[PDB]
Amino acid sequence: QKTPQIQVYSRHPPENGKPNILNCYVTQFHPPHIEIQMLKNGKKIPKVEMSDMSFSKDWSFYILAHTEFTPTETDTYACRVKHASMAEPKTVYWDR
Amino acid sequence: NYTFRCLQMSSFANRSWSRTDSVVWLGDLQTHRWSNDSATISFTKPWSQGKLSNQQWEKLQHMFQVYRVSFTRDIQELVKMMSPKEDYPIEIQLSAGCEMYPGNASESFLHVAFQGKYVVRFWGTSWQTVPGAPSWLDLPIKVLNADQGTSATVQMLLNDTCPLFVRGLLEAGKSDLEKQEKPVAWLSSVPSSAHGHRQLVCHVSGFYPKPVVMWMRGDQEQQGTHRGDFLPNADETWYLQATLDVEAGEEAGLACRVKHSSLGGQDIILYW
């Protein structure tokens, strides 16, 4: 078993009130079965697109999740991952 | 100078449940997807058939269709006899393809992992376990090595078909493979794990190809620049950030400079 690493980042420079894309890149996990959710103010974003599952030279799996979003001053965004390596779901917050 | 890789991911949860999913990459662009749910291999590029004809592609696909079913059955047959030495859940990964070199050369490979660990390869004319692989694999590998039709086919696929196919992709996929997308950069800051510091972040996104970032004070490179990993965007461009943990007030005079093939001598420089 390998524990997923999670990184959250925007496609474009964030400006409040401008449409953008938020990416949640999940890496270094094994086995490949995994659940990834993107959250807005603590609630699941319904339409999140998922790349195909793939793997690295080292055999660990990776996958990209992304969703359309328009940041504001007060909205918080996160990516939450459930996986058999972790008793608890891991949540990573988008910075600023 | 590219690496072509076909990646297969197979999961066996029990006697009744299995799935096998594949993806194919030419360097860092995806060319194919082959889902468990689909009969046929899907192209993820206009040029994914390379320079093979429809007939050649059909034959190649047929061989892989036969293979996927034969593979699933052989593995489950092997899980019935091995029980309870090794049992479910079982993960198998294959990574097969070739590396294309300066004009002439090409080398092919076929590697297999079991439960996340490299255990088998095809090499020359036969399947081999790697040193340190579990010894119960020796008999299945012998059985597999007795199948000379499989060995001949795999030899043809690695020696011939793989470099042939990739030459065609390189030609037919020229403008995507040699595309140039420009980085857009921006600066931010986040709390530092060190007291009395802030972490300055230079973000670089939308660039293609991969090669690309330094914090600067005038002409002086800041050796504290911590470059992160290359992270994919969803539109086949790349994202990278470079951080710098800075004392308060030491912040003034800092710039982030970015160099990329697509900017043609004209670096981006942002000032904090």
Ligand SMILES: CCCCCCCCCCCCCCCCCCCCCCCCCC(=O)N[C@@H](CO[C@H]1O[C@H](CO)[C@H](O)[C@H](O)[C@H]1O)[C@H](O)[C@H](O)CCCC(=O)NCCCCCCc1ccccc1
């Ligand atoms: C590779 C690069 C190709 C060029 C690129 C082309 C790109 C096009 C797009 C590609 C998209 C592809 C996605 C797939 C990626 C994976 C590629 C792997 C490809 C390698 C597999 C090709 C096998 C074809 C032959 C074959 O089918 N052999 C069968 C059938 O056998 C009968 O029929 C044939 C011809 O019809 C002959 O009549 C034979 O005599 C006859 O017995 C055999 O039952 C064989 O057993 C299948 C399984 C072989 C195999 O996996 N072995 C892997 C090693 C075993 C696993 C090791 C680890 C392990 C773990 C747990 C338990 C045990 C072992």
Ligand SMILES: *[C@@H]1O[C@H](CO)[C@@H](O[C@@H]2O[C@H](CO)[C@@H](O)[C@H](O)[C@H]2NC(C)=O)[C@H](O)[C@H]1NC(C)=O
């Ligand atoms: C595919 O290529 C391999 C070379 O990678 C060939 O295997 C070699 O064959 C020679 C001459 O017959 C043997 O003496 C070598 O020992 C083999 N090399 C290795 C590393 O094992 C193989 O014959 C080729 N197959 C086809 C159909 O062309």
Ligand SMILES: *[C@@H]1O[C@H](CO)[C@@H](O)[C@H](O)[C@H]1NC(C)=O
């Ligand atoms: C087999 O595995 C699948 C997927 O984990 C599960 O939903 C199913 O109930 C299992 N079936 C048996 C017979 O164990």
Ligand SMILES: *[C@@H]1O[C@H](CO)[C@@H](O)[C@H](O)[C@H]1NC(C)=O
């Ligand atoms: C994967 O495909 C096989 C063959 O079509 C099918 O029978 C099997 O049920 C599929 N597995 C899952 C989990 O959907």
Ligand code: NA
């Ligand atoms: Na598949």
Ligand code: NA
């Ligand atoms: Na594996």
